RNA sequence: CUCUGACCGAAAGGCGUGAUGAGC
RNA sequence: CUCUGACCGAAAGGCGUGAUGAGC
């Protein structure tokens, strides 16, 4: 049992979100900065992982040609058009010293994407030793945010379903609770596919159903280690299609 | 008797429990069902909580005993989750109930808790 | 001349601040997380590079020994501590998989520290081409903040000294300009040692002395590349003793 | 004549500058000193600006010509910063001076701008 | 300091192991 | 959209290449 493993899982999911923040931050800098040398590449490569991968392995404009752009694995339209904008760009010239420091920034953002993947692998595997039922229902990541929002597995296992349904809506909840404003129907559980994409008019009842099952899965994970997730998912599948039915 | 049943409840005590629930329903206030019951315990609004002993999966009511020890609320088992439910005035069954205000039952509540105070210790 | 190198120094100095933002964020996370395995190291290694270097090269409590701690290069009372706190700790146990992912985070932050020193040296060497005088008076880092706040060397070289004294105080200045409230006596130049460490009653006068000299230093860097910073650094020493003399 | 002197001011014109500043001081409003002058230019409050040609370093006033061509304000050179300083009514020197409102000197201002429009083109 | 609480469905049935209402 | 603007010092002196006053 141990019993601190849920705390480390929490740390890791929070870590994942923290890592996400810095990637978004460094990438932005990377784009603003390499744009002094090559302004157009920005709109061409809206996908960060691709933009960072470019700067890192290509660098200065002089190094591009047809060759290196395929080994980068970008499509054929994308290549000739970036290849075109180059030979023709209005960007400032960079020295070898100048481009090297921005290539070092890219190299680091790449290390980070790998770190991000490492964390996401850890959470996914650790989640099988911590709350298998939660994983089965909502996915590894979502179950971690739930544990995380509640403060731990035990703290989750103690909550009424109605608290679970609103975890991660804390602002909305406390607003309602004070001024009698209309309550949130969902917190983080909105991510759950069946909720996030469904007629807006059945989203509330699905959240209510899912939270009920999440409460039972959490109590079992914590107090037994018994595996009921299959019944649970099926009984949930049942109740959703039944909701889907009449509306 | 599933592990979450921490002590043995005389066939008698069980019977008063169910009728403490019944008159507390008409002359008093109760919250039926595990979520509402749990809510009641954390708000210290619970005089007593009845836990059915046939719950499936049994882990559903497994958070009540410790949560009750922490707020120092007395809790008793009854044999049947369907019986418990009719005692509280509902067509279906109920895995737990809490009495908010005992109404005309305060006598019964008191003595359930005294006879309970022992079985624990 | 090129003429875009001043925009590159700007990105670099903004980047240097971002890297600092992320290092903090991730180091705060490193400590919360590793503290689950080893609570007591937190206070014992208050200095970040030291905590990171530890988690990264030591890891699990089972590897701590008199040997590896000296090779990590920390003092004698420290290492006499950490050895008691360690075997007697109240922190949770960690498997191999659990500690491997937290050490990955600490290998990352380290890359980040090396990236920060790379930026710090790139600014320092770049400043020597871009604004040698500006660098001499105030140091490369601060000189880059000035250029950054101004919007470029040219913009900064078009400014009155009164603007330069307040660069970085943008809100307090506007608020003084709108309502009429007392003006800021300094912006970023507040870091100049002779300002922030001097008797509070002389700070405005040293600010206004320094702003004076920076405006002249920026005009020379931009319009000539002539090098006057020796006299400028003396006339300023004089004026600062002359200021200290009477107070 | 240092590179920031972009045209050759006839010994006469210079002398009409110094007494335009002189009378615009008493009968009008001027700004003495390079930081006030530059402030007066960016605010379009400069009618004319005079710039000494003996400034050391010469880069202290080197931003005044470009900045003046963007706001269109006419500028002219006088040979001495001490002279310019006195003409402005201060004991020390002045690297540049701007007349805000000419006062009883506007006549001189206009013709300085006219003769200067030429030395540019 | 952490929503509501018995109805829903044309019926078959669903529903306190949570109906209904509800601002991630 | 980006402070103030001729004083300060017991004097020697400093000071529009910025005195004084002023909420990084």
Coordinates of C-alpha atoms in Angstrom, one line a residue, chain C residues 8-183:
Chain C
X8 CA 18.1 41.1 -30.5
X9 CA 19.6 42.2 -27.2
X10 CA 16.0 43.2 -26.3
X11 CA 14.5 39.8 -27.0
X12 CA 17.5 38.3 -25.1
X13 CA 16.8 40.4 -22.0
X14 CA 13.1 39.7 -22.1
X15 CA 14.0 36.0 -22.5
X16 CA 16.3 36.2 -19.5
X17 CA 13.4 37.4 -17.4
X18 CA 11.1 34.7 -18.7
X19 CA 13.7 32.0 -18.0
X20 CA 13.9 33.4 -14.5
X21 CA 10.0 33.3 -14.2
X22 CA 10.0 29.6 -15.2
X23 CA 13.0 28.6 -13.1
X24 CA 11.2 29.8 -10.1
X25 CA 7.9 28.2 -11.0
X26 CA 9.6 24.8 -11.6
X27 CA 11.9 25.0 -8.6
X28 CA 8.9 25.7 -6.4
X29 CA 7.4 22.6 -7.8
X30 CA 10.6 20.6 -7.4
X31 CA 10.6 21.4 -3.7
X32 CA 7.0 20.6 -3.1
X33 CA 7.4 17.3 -4.9
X34 CA 10.8 16.1 -3.6
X35 CA 9.6 17.2 -0.1
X36 CA 7.1 14.3 -0.1
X37 CA 10.2 12.0 -0.1
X38 CA 12.4 14.2 2.0
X39 CA 10.6 17.0 3.9
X40 CA 13.6 18.3 5.8
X41 CA 15.9 19.2 2.9
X42 CA 13.7 22.1 2.0
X43 CA 14.9 24.5 4.7
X44 CA 18.3 22.9 4.9
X45 CA 19.1 23.9 1.2
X46 CA 17.4 27.3 0.9
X47 CA 19.7 28.1 -2.1
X48 CA 18.1 26.9 -5.4
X49 CA 21.1 25.7 -7.5
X50 CA 22.1 23.7 -4.4
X51 CA 18.7 22.0 -4.0
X52 CA 18.5 21.2 -7.7
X53 CA 22.1 20.0 -7.9
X54 CA 21.2 17.7 -5.0
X55 CA 18.0 16.2 -6.3
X56 CA 19.6 15.8 -9.6
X57 CA 22.8 14.0 -8.5
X58 CA 21.6 12.3 -5.3
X59 CA 17.9 11.4 -5.7
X60 CA 16.6 8.8 -3.2
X61 CA 17.5 9.0 0.5
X62 CA 19.2 5.6 0.2
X63 CA 22.0 7.3 -1.8
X64 CA 22.9 10.0 0.7
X65 CA 26.2 9.2 2.3
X66 CA 29.3 11.2 3.6
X67 CA 31.0 10.5 0.2
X68 CA 28.6 11.9 -2.4
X69 CA 27.7 15.0 -0.3
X70 CA 31.3 16.4 -0.1
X71 CA 31.7 15.8 -3.9
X72 CA 28.6 17.9 -4.2
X73 CA 30.7 20.6 -2.4
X74 CA 28.7 21.8 0.6
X75 CA 29.9 22.8 4.0
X76 CA 30.8 20.6 7.1
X77 CA 27.9 21.5 9.4
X78 CA 25.4 21.1 6.5
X79 CA 26.7 17.6 5.7
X80 CA 26.6 16.7 9.4
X81 CA 23.0 17.7 9.1
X82 CA 21.1 16.0 6.3
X83 CA 22.6 12.8 7.7
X84 CA 20.6 12.9 10.9
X85 CA 17.5 14.4 9.2
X86 CA 17.8 11.7 6.5
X87 CA 17.8 8.3 8.3
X88 CA 15.3 9.7 10.9
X89 CA 13.0 11.5 8.4
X90 CA 9.2 11.4 8.4
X91 CA 8.9 11.6 4.6
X92 CA 7.2 9.0 2.5
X93 CA 9.1 6.2 0.8
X94 CA 9.6 6.5 -3.0
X95 CA 10.0 3.6 -5.5
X96 CA 12.5 3.8 -8.4
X97 CA 9.8 5.0 -10.8
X98 CA 8.6 7.7 -8.4
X99 CA 12.0 9.3 -7.9
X100 CA 13.1 8.9 -11.5
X101 CA 10.4 11.3 -12.7
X102 CA 11.2 14.0 -10.1
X103 CA 14.9 13.8 -10.9
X104 CA 14.0 14.3 -14.6
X105 CA 12.4 17.6 -13.5
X106 CA 15.7 18.5 -11.7
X107 CA 17.8 17.6 -14.8
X108 CA 15.5 20.0 -16.7
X109 CA 15.8 22.9 -14.4
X110 CA 19.6 22.5 -14.6
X111 CA 19.5 22.8 -18.4
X112 CA 17.5 25.9 -17.7
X113 CA 20.3 27.3 -15.5
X114 CA 22.8 26.7 -18.2
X115 CA 20.5 28.4 -20.7
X116 CA 20.3 31.4 -18.4
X117 CA 24.1 31.8 -18.2
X118 CA 24.1 31.5 -22.0
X119 CA 21.7 34.4 -22.3
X120 CA 23.6 36.4 -19.6
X121 CA 26.9 36.1 -21.6
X122 CA 25.2 36.8 -24.9
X123 CA 23.9 40.1 -23.7
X124 CA 27.2 40.9 -22.1
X125 CA 29.1 40.4 -25.4
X126 CA 26.4 41.9 -27.5
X127 CA 26.3 45.1 -25.5
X128 CA 29.9 45.6 -26.4
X129 CA 28.9 46.0 -30.1
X130 CA 25.6 47.7 -29.5
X131 CA 26.2 50.2 -26.6
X132 CA 29.8 50.1 -25.1
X133 CA 29.3 53.3 -23.1
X134 CA 25.9 52.4 -21.7
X135 CA 27.4 49.1 -20.7
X136 CA 30.3 50.8 -18.8
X137 CA 28.3 53.2 -16.6
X138 CA 25.5 50.8 -15.5
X139 CA 26.6 47.3 -16.6
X140 CA 25.3 45.2 -19.5
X141 CA 22.2 43.8 -17.9
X142 CA 20.8 47.1 -16.8
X143 CA 21.8 48.8 -20.0
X144 CA 19.7 46.2 -21.9
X145 CA 16.7 46.9 -19.7
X146 CA 16.9 50.6 -20.6
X147 CA 17.2 49.9 -24.3
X148 CA 14.3 47.4 -23.9
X149 CA 12.0 49.9 -22.1
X150 CA 12.8 52.6 -24.5
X151 CA 12.0 50.4 -27.4
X152 CA 15.5 50.4 -28.9
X153 CA 18.8 52.3 -28.9
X154 CA 17.6 55.0 -31.3
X155 CA 14.5 55.6 -29.2
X156 CA 16.6 55.8 -26.1
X157 CA 19.1 58.2 -27.8
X158 CA 16.2 60.5 -28.7
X159 CA 15.2 60.9 -25.1
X160 CA 15.5 63.7 -22.5
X161 CA 17.3 62.7 -19.3
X162 CA 14.0 63.2 -17.3
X163 CA 12.4 60.3 -19.3
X164 CA 15.5 58.0 -18.7
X165 CA 15.4 58.6 -14.9
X166 CA 11.8 57.1 -14.9
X167 CA 12.0 54.3 -17.5
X168 CA 10.4 51.3 -15.8
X169 CA 8.3 53.5 -13.5
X170 CA 5.7 53.8 -16.3
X171 CA 2.6 53.4 -14.0
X172 CA 3.7 55.8 -11.2
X173 CA 4.6 58.4 -13.8
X174 CA 1.3 58.2 -15.6
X175 CA -0.5 58.2 -12.4
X176 CA 1.5 61.4 -11.4
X177 CA 0.8 62.8 -14.9
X178 CA -3.0 62.2 -14.7
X179 CA -3.9 62.9 -11.0
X180 CA -1.0 65.1 -9.9
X181 CA 0.5 62.7 -7.3
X182 CA 4.2 62.7 -6.4
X183 CA 6.4 61.5 -9.3

